[PDB]
Amino acid sequence: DRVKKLINSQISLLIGKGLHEFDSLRDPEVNDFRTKMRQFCEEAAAHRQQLGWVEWLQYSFPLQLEPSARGNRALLVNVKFEGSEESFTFQVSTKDMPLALMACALRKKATVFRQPLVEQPEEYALQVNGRHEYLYGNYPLCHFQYICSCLHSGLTPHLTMVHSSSILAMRDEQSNPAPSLWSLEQPFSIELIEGRKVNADERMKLVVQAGLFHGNEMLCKTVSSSEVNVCSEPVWKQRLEFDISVCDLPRMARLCFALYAVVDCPIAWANLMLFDYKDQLKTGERCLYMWPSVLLNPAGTVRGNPNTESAAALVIYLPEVAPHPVYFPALEKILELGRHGERGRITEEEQLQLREILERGELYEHEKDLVWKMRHEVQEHFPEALARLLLVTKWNKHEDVAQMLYLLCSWPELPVLSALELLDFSFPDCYVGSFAIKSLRKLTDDELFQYLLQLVQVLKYESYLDCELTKFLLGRALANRKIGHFLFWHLRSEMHVPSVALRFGLIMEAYCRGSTHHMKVLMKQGEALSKLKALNDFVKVSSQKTTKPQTKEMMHMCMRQETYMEALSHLQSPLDPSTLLEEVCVEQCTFMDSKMKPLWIMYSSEEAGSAGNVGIIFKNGDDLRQDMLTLQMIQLMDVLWKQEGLDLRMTPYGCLPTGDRTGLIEVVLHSDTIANIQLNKSNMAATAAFNKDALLNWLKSKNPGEALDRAIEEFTLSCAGYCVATYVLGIGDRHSDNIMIRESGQLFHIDFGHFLGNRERVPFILTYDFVHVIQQGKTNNSEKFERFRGYCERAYTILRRHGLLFLHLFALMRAAGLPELSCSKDIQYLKDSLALGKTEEEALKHFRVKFNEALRESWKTKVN
Ligand SMILES: COc1ncc2cc1NS(=O)(=O)CCN(C)Cc1ccc3c(c1)N2CCO3
Numbered sequence: 001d002r003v004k005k006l007i008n009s010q011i012s013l014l015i016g017k018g019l020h021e022f023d024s025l026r027d028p029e030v031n032d033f034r035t036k037m038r039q040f041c042e043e044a045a046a047h048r049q050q051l052g053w054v055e056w057l058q059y060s061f062p063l064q065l066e067p068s069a070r071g072n073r074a075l076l077v078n079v080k081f082e083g084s085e086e087s088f089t090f091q092v093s094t095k096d097m098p099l100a101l102m103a104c105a106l107r108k109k110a111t112v113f114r115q116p117l118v119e120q121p122e123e124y125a126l127q128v129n130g131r132h133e134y135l136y137g138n139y140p141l142c143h144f145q146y147i148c149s150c151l152h153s154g155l156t157p158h159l160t161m162v163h164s165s166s167i168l169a170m171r172d173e174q175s176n177p178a179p180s181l182w183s184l185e186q187p188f189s190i191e192l193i194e195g196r197k198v199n200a201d202e203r204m205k206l207v208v209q210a211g212l213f214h215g216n217e218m219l220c221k222t223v224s225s226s227e228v229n230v231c232s233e234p235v236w237k238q239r240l241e242f243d244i245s246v247c248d249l250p251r252m253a254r255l256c257f258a259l260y261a262v263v264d265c266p267i268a269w270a271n272l273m274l275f276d277y278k279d280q281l282k283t284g285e286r287c288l289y290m291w292p293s294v295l296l297n298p299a300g301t302v303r304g305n306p307n308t309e310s311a312a313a314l315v316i317y318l319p320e321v322a323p324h325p326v327y328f329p330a331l332e333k334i335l336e337l338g339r340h341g342e343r344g345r346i347t348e349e350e351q352l353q354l355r356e357i358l359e360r361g362e363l364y365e366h367e368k369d370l371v372w373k374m375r376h377e378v379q380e381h382f383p384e385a386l387a388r389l390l391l392v393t394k395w396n397k398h399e400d401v402a403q404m405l406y407l408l409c410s411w412p413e414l415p416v417l418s419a420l421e422l423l424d425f426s427f428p429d430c431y432v433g434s435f436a437i438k439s440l441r442k443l444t445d446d447e448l449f450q451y452l453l454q455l456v457q458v459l460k461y462e463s464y465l466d467c468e469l470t471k472f473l474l475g476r477a478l479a480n481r482k483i484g485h486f487l488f489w490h491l492r493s494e495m496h497v498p499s500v501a502l503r504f505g506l507i508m509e510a511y512c513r514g515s516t517h518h519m520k521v522l523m524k525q526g527e528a529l530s531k532l533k534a535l536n537d538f539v540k541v542s543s544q545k546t547t548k549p550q551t552k553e554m555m556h557m558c559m560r561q562e563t564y565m566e567a568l569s570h571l572q573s574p575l576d577p578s579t580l581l582e583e584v585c586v587e588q589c590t591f592m593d594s595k596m597k598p599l600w601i602m603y604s605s606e607e608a609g610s611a612g613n614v615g616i617i618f619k620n621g622d623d624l625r626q627d628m629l630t631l632q633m634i635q636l637m638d639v640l641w642k643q644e645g646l647d648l649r650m651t652p653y654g655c656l657p658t659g660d661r662t663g664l665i666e667v668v669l670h671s672d673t674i675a676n677i678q679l680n681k682s683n684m685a686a687t688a689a690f691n692k693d694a695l696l697n698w699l700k701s702k703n704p705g706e707a708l709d710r711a712i713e714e715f716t717l718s719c720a721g722y723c724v725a726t727y728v729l730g731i732g733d734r735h736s737d738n739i740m741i742r743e744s745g746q747l748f749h750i751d752f753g754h755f756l757g758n759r760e761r762v763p764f765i766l767t768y769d770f771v772h773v774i775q776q777g778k779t780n781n782s783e784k785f786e787r788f789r790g791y792c793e794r795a796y797t798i799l800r801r802h803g804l805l806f807l808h809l810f811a812l813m814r815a816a817g818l819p820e821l822s823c824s825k826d827i828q829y830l831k832d833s834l835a836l837g838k839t840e841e842e843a844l845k846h847f848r849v850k851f852n853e854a855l856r857e858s859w860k861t862k863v864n
Contacts, residue, residue, distance in 0.1 A: 003177050007516060014523050015508040016495045022506065029277045033465040033506055040471065041514030044478035045176045053164045054136065056171045057125055060481045061134040062445055064578070067642040069143035070446055075151070077141075079105040079126070081161045086112070094142035094151070098126055098135050105161055125167060129158040130608025133578045153744070158609060174517040181281065181329060182337075182398060184246035184321050188212065191317035192225055193285075195234040195259060198312045204261040206234045208314065211256045212242050212249075213298040214395040215428030219253060220244040222296065230261060246281075246321050249274055250395050251328050252428045252463060254302055257288065257314055258295040266293035268312045271302045277464045279328040281321065288314040291499070299425055299815070301499045302463050331431075335409060338402030344374040351377075358385040368392040372400075375407060383412050387421050390432060405431055414439045416447065420454075420808045423469075425461045425815070437468045445480050450639070452483065453632055454812035456490040459507075460500060461815055470507060478514040485577045487511065488522055489656055496660035524571045528581075529658055531567040532599060532618040535559065539597045540621075552590055555599075559586045568601070575654035575666045579614055580605060588615075596621035600667065615667025624663035626818055628655045630752035633806070634725050637799060641721070644798050648721030648791065649714050651740075651748035670743040672698075674769070675736035695741070695769055696777045702743040711745030716774050716784070718747045720791035725749075727764045727850070728799055728806075728833045730757035734765060756829040758820045764847075764854040768861040789851065796847050803834045 012018045022030055048059060073094040079101065080087035088108045092101055102121035110117045126135040128146050141147045141157075150157045192208055200206065205227035212219035220243040228234050258269045268290035275281055289304035289311045305311040354374050357367050359382075371378065371392045378389045386408075394400040408431060414422075421427075422436035443451070458469060477484040488511060491504040512519040538558055542551040558564060565584065573579035581603040588602035598619045605612025635652035654666030677698045680688050685701035688694040703711040726734065731752060738751040747770070774788050775781035799806070810827050820826060835843035 007177070007512075007519075010519060010523060011509055011512045014512065014519055014526060015492070015505050017501065017505045019509065022502075022509075029465050030502070030506065032277070034509070036466060037470070037474065037506070037510035038513045041474060041478060041510045042176070044475065045514050045516075048478070049171065049175050051171065053167045053171070054125075057134055057136055057167060059479065060170070060174075061132060061578075062480050062482055063137060063139070064133060064145040065139065065446075066143050066145055066148050067639045068645065069139060070444070073142075073151075075141065075147070076156050077101060078156050078158045079108075079161060080129075080159075081105070081109060082127075082163065082166055088112075089156070092141065094147070095140045097138055097140055099138075101141070101159075102126065102161060119163065123164050124161050125164075126159045127162050128611075129160055130580055130582070130605040130612045131578055132572060132580060134162070135159065155610070158611070176514075176516045181249075181326050182247045184326065186246055186321065187241050188244050188246050188249060189239055189241040189319060190255070191319070192236040192238050192240055193315040193317055194236060196232075196313040196315065197310065198230070198232055198234055198259070198267070200230045200261040200265065200267055202230050204230050204263060204265065206230055206267075207260055207262055208236065209258040209260065209295055210240055210242075211296045211298070212244060213254050213256055213296075214250050214252055215425050216298055217395060217426075219249070219396045227262065244396055248396055248398050249281075250398070250401055251275060251279075251430055254298060254463070256296045256298050256300075257290070257316075258293065258297065259290065259312060259314065260293075260295055264295070266295055268314075269293050269295070269297045269300060270304065270314060271298065271300050273302050273463050275328050277466065281326040281328070282318045283320050284318055286316045286318060288316060290314060299461065301460070303499070303502065306498050306501070331405075331409075334402050334405050337399065338404070338406030341376075341403050341406075343376045346374065355382075358382045358388060361388065375403070379407050379411060384414060384418055386411060386414065387418065387427065390422075390427055390429075395429075408432065408435055411435065413442075416440060416443055417805060417808065420451065420805075420812070423455070423458045423461075424808070424811050428461075428463075430463075434468050437472050440472070445476070445483060448476055449483060449486070450632075450636060451809065452486055453490060453629070454809050456487065457812055457815040459503060462503070465503060465506060474507065474510055474514070477511060481518065482577055484511065484515065484518060485522075485572075488518075489574055489658060493657040493659055493663070521572060525574050527567045528571050529574070529618075529662070531564055532601070533620055533659075533662065535564070536591075536597065536599055536618060536620045539591050539599065543591075543597055548593070555589065555591065556586050559584065559589060573614070573616065573654075574658055575616065575656050575664050580608065580612070581614065581616065582606075582608070582612060598622070602667075613669065615669065617665035617667055618663075619665065620662050622663075623661050624655055624657045624665070625816065626755065626820065627665075627752045628657060628663075629813060629816070629818070629821075630729060630731065630755055631655050633729060633809075636806075636809075637721070637725055637728075637795075640802050641795055641798055646791075646794060646798065647717070648795060649718045649744075649746050650721050650725075651718070651742065651746055653748075668740070668742065668748070671740050671748075673737050674739045674741065677741065678736055678769070692769060692772050693777070696773050698741075699745055699773065703745065712773060712776055714745035715741070715747055715770075716788050717791060718745075719770055719774065720788055720795055722747060722749050723765065724792055724795040724799065727762070728796070728830070729755050730762040730829050730833060731755055732757065732762045754820065756820055756826045759825070761829070761832070763857070764850040766851070766854040766858040768858050771858060771862075792851060793844065793847065797840060797844060800834050800836070800840070800843055803836045806830060806834065807836070 008019050022034065051059060075092050075094050076089060077092055078087050078089050088105060090104060099121050102124050106117055106119060106121055133146060135144050147157055195206065198206065207227055208225040209222055211222040223240045223242055225236050225238060228236060253274045254271050255274055256271045259267045261267060270288040270290040272286065272288065289308055290313060291305050350370065354370060354377065357363060371389060375389055378385050393404040419436050419439035422432060455473060462469065473487060477487040488508060491508050494500050494504055535555065535558060539551060539555055542554050568584045569582065571581050573581050582605035583603060585602040585604050590600045592598045596619060598617055600615060600617060602615045631652050634650060638650040638652055641648055651668055653668050657663040677686065678691060678694050680691055680694050686694060686698040688697050699711050700708060726749060731749065732754045738749065739747065740750055741747050775784050807830060810830055813821055835846050
């Protein structure tokens, strides 16, 4: 008590939902989750508080390595010892490991301080100055992202020697405070009693459409009520009998409802699991608080609408199918039934038919019959074809499900790629999901981080609160502070969505039990975001009444207040926990002229020097979820290309929704839009004789002498990357104001509100302004242009080879409820852009035709 009461009030404020609201529900599923997950997260907390000092560096500052390093050249480094003004600058090689650098700094200190030190290089770690980032382990310096960045930008790495006792003092201070169905052969049936708080046109009639689903797949035909006159409280009091026995209902069977008005006018929909969280087949009266429709929705949540006051409610009755409670058979009873079967002793000709269709993904009924018959052969010689076999399994026949389950329980572990496919709502079985998680345990923290966003969306397909995916995500989050950081923010940003608020709020509470210190760290971030919202509202009001210089001076005065200076300063960035947002640079803060007046907040850090000069963009009113997905997809391409030794110098900057139409974007400094550069302002070092000269002149002024060639090369590489990225993703609405260029020459895209050709197929784009720079400012430079076409081809063929990874990830994102990622049609776009139904030669020929057709469109600007 007292500390417990304080933690409870801090979790409530952090998650944006009072913990008392969980207790008011009086829900045993909610109560069992809270107790079990608190227990699981506190065990993780205790494991962590006793980690070795290097293990605790791995928890708190996971290594940031180059994609080529996962799984020569001279370098100048600056090293100081913790809390010392004195630093040493020395020459090392990119091939040297941190230990060699540390042993060298220790020899330098020993000679300066005139004593042979007690300390060995094994006792230290190198912190990147003013950053929550460390260099450690047996990796050459070039394999670290920080060193790599310093090399490309020519800057000097600045490192601090941190002794193991100082790391241990970090661990210690951050501590959690001290403490039988199968005999029921009758057809499935329900009583549709009545409707409540129903709003519809009195000239029409009300109908309830009802279906039995196992994921998206129907277990039998849909059934409908009789038409009853429209009113607030319609009364059906009728029996709805489905064509499927009670014994054949799979574990993950859901009963789906849709209420509508007819002369079709959709009103509401509601779903429920037929078995509870404790495997008991549901009986008795159920009051279903319906969700308003935008006709059956099986992917929809199986929990009632919390707004009980305004929601239309359907009252149903689940009949007593037995005198005693009926539970779903345990795994031992399932195995014993499915263990008995017949193996596919079939001809060598039909074996060639099977091999063909398993390596080939829709298939004709006779092929489904053959796949099912040859299921033993599928397990033994094609284990990666599990997803195809699971789709041919008859989920409405309990004996077929037992036979599938028996094979799954002895199925070998699958690659991460195959596992991600199995998390799709198309594989709704709980043992399948459990198996998918089992095959994902081998994900590295870097891979997990790359797919975290999609795994969090998968939580919306879960039928129960306590699931293997929640346990997996919590355990990985409590084992890695960066995973924990982003898991929190992905959950927090959806607390305003009623369908997920309970599930997401419960996961965040469990996590907080696991890391009291991190809760306080995220509270610091939440307080800055609260002040940014109040600051932005002020700007939106102030900007409609006065001029921008007046609103800017006001925003500054508001920021200069004690409460603002305190809340806005000294925090870890929500976009990147490695980034410390130290002193807010009020004078450099401003806002944009657009409708929502986004804020531009600048920071500085004495300790980080030039690297501490960072900015964040705060947006309130705009929805940044699609931008975040596109930027994560661009970053994925960048990793995939770097794994083949192809660095296209991309700028996948941070973008993170943090709340309801609220989020942050990472400022990329030393950059300007193509439109600003092309405005061709007079009395500037870039003023052009021809508007086409503007970008190159601007590049010339920023990169004098020999630096220009490096800048043209960076432009060319990034240009090839973004031409491929925008084409594959179907990024449209591309204009001079949503294309940026860095002083280094790097081109990058911004504002991804429209993707996947949003509906019209986006053609490959090539601009003459960009062609002019690639060609070093020459009319004819085929050597340079075709070297650019080589980069686009190479980048495109690498992406194609990971085509299925993009497909599986985008299929998982359908759960996000993004207006441009709703159906199969939206993903056909990525299937076409990657030309996945073709050979590498057929696809490359298609890309060439698409690139050439974009070169002719480009020449309509050149001709003038
Ligand atoms: C979806 O919106 C955005 N996406 C990316 C960027 C900015 C915005 N919005 S904005 O701040 O209103 C436009 C700022 N404009 C000066 C151009 C600019 C400059 C630097 C940027 C940037 C936009 N990005 C993120 C990277 O850093």
